[PDB]
Symmetry: C2
Subunit: 137 residues, 2 copies
């Protein structure tokens, strides 16, 4: 069967600024780069940045809610979010509708998130404060 996410590939319009964002600003590990892409890791996540002439820099009001959340500890969350804010990283959402999260944009407008907590923790929180119509299996 399927066993998890093998990799996340993000199309990017400008390779070097995207590599810098994920490696320098977000702290991910850069393993290789080439004329048309890069490979990074974030823990066990394999991230591929793929140079794509079709990628547009997309304002958050023009894209749907598809987004990518990265795990961070409770101890590190607030100072990492504040650093992104002080660095001028654009945002796309303010209301914490799914727990402790910080919503921010990459250089092309990919919707990213810092989140504290697992799926099990989110299910437990939702039992007390469920989303409208929620059922648990």
């Amino acid at each position: 069967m399927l066993s998890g996410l093998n990799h996340l590939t993000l199309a990017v319009s400008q390779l070097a600024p995207s590599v810098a964002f994920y490696q320098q600003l977000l702290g991910m590990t850069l393993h290789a780069r080439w004329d048309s892409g890069a490979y990074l890791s974030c823990g066990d996540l394999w991230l591929c940045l793929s140079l794509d002439p079709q990628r547009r820099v997309t304002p958050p009001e023009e894209s749907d809610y598809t987004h990518y959340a990265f795990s961070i500890s409770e101890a590190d969350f607030a100072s990492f979010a504040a650093r992104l804010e002080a660095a001028g990283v654009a945002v796309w959402k303010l209301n914490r509708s799914e727990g402790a999260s910080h919503y921010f944009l990459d250089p092309d407008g990919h919707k990213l998130e810092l989140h504290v907590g697992s799926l099990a923790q989110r299910l437990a929180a939702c039992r007390e404060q469920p989303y409208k119509g929620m059922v648990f299996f």
Copy 2:
């Protein structure tokens, strides 16, 4: 410090066909559903389906290369691909890289992939046959 992918959220135009696709066709575990979304798991992956009226059913020629690859074993790959083909799931690309890959579309045109092989395997192949301009770190 970021420690991995926390969750992947896909915006969906119609919740019931997307739940059918990810749970029934792709075999993911459904943990909860509410009036505007669902939570599933696939191994370590926490997947959220978020009902979003801004999601367009998007032809693959009209989206960029951003895509989401799921892990499967080599032994299971061909029968899972045949299952998707029997269900009429569209393919958006042929495989031309190392490691088996099947490139298929979700009901809203999200670009998905089945892939066999790790980042380490890809890096080993690249060190033997580097892409144009490739540098390692």
